[PDB]
Amino acid sequence: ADKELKFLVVDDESTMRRIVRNLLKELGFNNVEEAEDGVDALNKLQAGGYGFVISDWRMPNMDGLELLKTIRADGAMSALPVLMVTAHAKKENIIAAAQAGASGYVVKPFTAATLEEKLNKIFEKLGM
Ligand code: BEF
Numbered sequence: 001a002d003k004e005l006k007f008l009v010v011d012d013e014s015t016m017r018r019i020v021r022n023l024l025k026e027l028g029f030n031n032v033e034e035a036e037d038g039v040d041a042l043n044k045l046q047a048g049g050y051g052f053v054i055s056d057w058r059m060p061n062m063d064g065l066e067l068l069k070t071i072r073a074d075g076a077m078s079a080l081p082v083l084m085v086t087a088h089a090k091k092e093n094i095i096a097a098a099q100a101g102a103s104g105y106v107v108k109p110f111t112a113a114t115l116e117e118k119l120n121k122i123f124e125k126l127g128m
Protein backbone atom coordinates (compact mmCIF):
# COMPACT_ATOMS: atom_id res chain seq x y z
CA ALA A 1 0.00 0.00 0.00
CA ASP A 2 0.95 3.70 -0.42
CA LYS A 3 3.28 4.47 2.50
CA GLU A 4 1.80 7.96 2.74
CA LEU A 5 -1.64 6.46 3.51
CA LYS A 6 -3.05 8.46 6.43
CA PHE A 7 -4.20 6.28 9.37
CA LEU A 8 -6.46 7.18 12.29
CA VAL A 9 -5.83 4.97 15.34
CA VAL A 10 -8.76 5.04 17.74
CA ASP A 11 -8.72 3.57 21.22
CA ASP A 12 -9.51 4.93 24.63
CA GLU A 13 -6.26 3.43 26.05
CA SER A 14 -3.09 5.36 25.19
CA THR A 15 -1.12 2.12 25.53
CA MET A 16 -3.03 0.41 22.71
CA ARG A 17 -2.83 3.48 20.45
CA ARG A 18 0.94 3.43 21.06
CA ILE A 19 1.19 -0.27 20.15
CA VAL A 20 -0.68 0.26 16.88
CA ARG A 21 1.21 3.43 15.89
CA ASN A 22 4.57 1.80 16.49
CA LEU A 23 3.49 -1.31 14.51
CA LEU A 24 2.34 0.93 11.65
CA LYS A 25 5.74 2.73 11.79
CA GLU A 26 7.56 -0.62 11.48
CA LEU A 27 5.38 -1.45 8.42
CA GLY A 28 6.45 1.86 6.83
CA PHE A 29 3.45 4.07 7.66
CA ASN A 30 4.35 7.31 9.43
CA ASN A 31 1.29 9.43 8.53
CA VAL A 32 -0.60 8.35 11.65
CA GLU A 33 -2.91 10.26 13.99
CA GLU A 34 -4.74 9.18 17.10
CA ALA A 35 -8.20 9.66 18.57
CA GLU A 36 -9.48 8.74 22.02
CA ASP A 37 -13.11 7.89 21.25
CA GLY A 38 -15.59 7.78 18.36
CA VAL A 39 -16.46 11.47 18.73
CA ASP A 40 -12.85 12.61 18.74
CA ALA A 41 -12.34 10.26 15.70
CA LEU A 42 -15.18 11.79 13.66
CA ASN A 43 -13.80 15.32 14.36
CA LYS A 44 -10.45 14.18 12.96
CA LEU A 45 -12.07 12.41 9.99
CA GLN A 46 -14.17 15.55 9.26
CA ALA A 47 -10.88 17.46 9.22
CA GLY A 48 -10.01 15.37 6.17
CA GLY A 49 -7.32 13.39 4.41
CA TYR A 50 -7.76 9.99 6.12
CA GLY A 51 -7.49 6.74 4.18
CA PHE A 52 -7.63 4.05 6.89
CA VAL A 53 -9.17 3.73 10.35
CA ILE A 54 -8.14 1.24 13.04
CA SER A 55 -10.62 1.22 15.92
CA ASP A 56 -11.31 -0.21 19.31
CA TRP A 57 -14.85 -1.06 20.31
CA ARG A 58 -15.40 -0.25 24.00
CA MET A 59 -14.91 3.52 24.39
CA PRO A 60 -16.76 6.39 26.04
CA ASN A 61 -18.66 9.14 24.14
CA MET A 62 -19.08 6.96 21.03
CA ASP A 63 -18.10 3.32 20.85
CA GLY A 64 -16.39 1.66 17.90
CA LEU A 65 -19.52 -0.11 16.55
CA GLU A 66 -21.35 3.26 16.44
CA LEU A 67 -18.27 4.83 14.87
CA LEU A 68 -18.19 2.11 12.18
CA LYS A 69 -21.90 2.50 11.49
CA THR A 70 -21.52 6.28 11.29
CA ILE A 71 -18.61 6.10 8.86
CA ARG A 72 -20.43 3.53 6.67
CA ALA A 73 -23.65 5.66 6.47
CA ASP A 74 -21.81 8.88 5.68
CA GLY A 75 -21.61 9.52 1.95
CA ALA A 76 -18.30 11.37 2.34
CA MET A 77 -16.61 8.29 3.95
CA SER A 78 -18.81 5.26 3.29
CA ALA A 79 -16.03 3.04 1.85
CA LEU A 80 -13.28 4.13 4.25
CA PRO A 81 -11.38 1.02 5.44
CA VAL A 82 -12.13 0.26 9.08
CA LEU A 83 -10.22 -2.48 10.95
CA MET A 84 -11.66 -3.33 14.36
CA VAL A 85 -9.10 -4.14 17.06
CA THR A 86 -10.94 -5.08 20.22
CA ALA A 87 -10.97 -7.32 23.31
CA HIS A 88 -14.55 -8.35 22.21
CA ALA A 89 -14.07 -11.99 21.30
CA LYS A 90 -17.64 -13.29 21.14
CA LYS A 91 -19.03 -14.44 17.79
CA GLU A 92 -22.06 -12.15 18.21
CA ASN A 93 -19.65 -9.20 18.56
CA ILE A 94 -17.78 -10.22 15.40
CA ILE A 95 -21.13 -10.70 13.56
CA ALA A 96 -22.41 -7.27 14.64
CA ALA A 97 -19.19 -5.53 13.40
CA ALA A 98 -18.97 -7.65 10.23
CA GLN A 99 -22.59 -6.90 9.32
CA ALA A 100 -22.04 -3.19 10.09
CA GLY A 101 -19.32 -3.15 7.45
CA ALA A 102 -16.04 -3.87 9.26
CA SER A 103 -13.18 -4.30 6.81
CA GLY A 104 -11.55 -6.74 9.22
CA TYR A 105 -11.47 -7.65 12.88
CA VAL A 106 -8.57 -8.43 15.24
CA VAL A 107 -9.09 -9.70 18.80
CA LYS A 108 -6.89 -8.39 21.64
CA PRO A 109 -4.29 -9.55 22.63
CA PHE A 110 -2.81 -9.73 19.15
CA THR A 111 0.65 -10.24 17.76
CA ALA A 112 2.52 -7.97 15.43
CA ALA A 113 2.19 -10.66 12.75
CA THR A 114 -1.64 -10.79 13.05
CA LEU A 115 -1.99 -7.00 12.61
CA GLU A 116 0.21 -7.02 9.45
CA GLU A 117 -1.66 -10.07 8.02
CA LYS A 118 -5.07 -8.52 8.61
CA LEU A 119 -3.98 -5.11 7.24
CA ASN A 120 -2.58 -6.78 4.12
CA LYS A 121 -5.82 -8.81 3.74
CA ILE A 122 -7.75 -5.53 3.61
CA PHE A 123 -5.23 -3.86 1.23
CA GLU A 124 -5.64 -6.85 -1.14
CA LYS A 125 -9.47 -6.88 -0.87
CA LEU A 126 -9.60 -3.17 -1.81
CA GLY A 127 -6.83 -3.27 -4.43
CA MET A 128 -4.61 -0.99 -2.33
F1 BEF B 1 -11.99 -1.51 24.70
BE1 BEF B 1 -11.74 -2.31 23.19
F2 BEF B 1 -13.17 -3.05 22.54
F3 BEF B 1 -10.50 -3.52 23.31
Ligand SMILES: [Mn+2]
Residues within 6 Å of the ligand: 011, 012, 013, 056, 057, 058, 059
Ligand atom coordinates in the same frame (compact mmCIF):
# COMPACT_ATOMS: atom_id res chain seq x y z
MN1 LIG C 1 -11.42 0.35 24.96
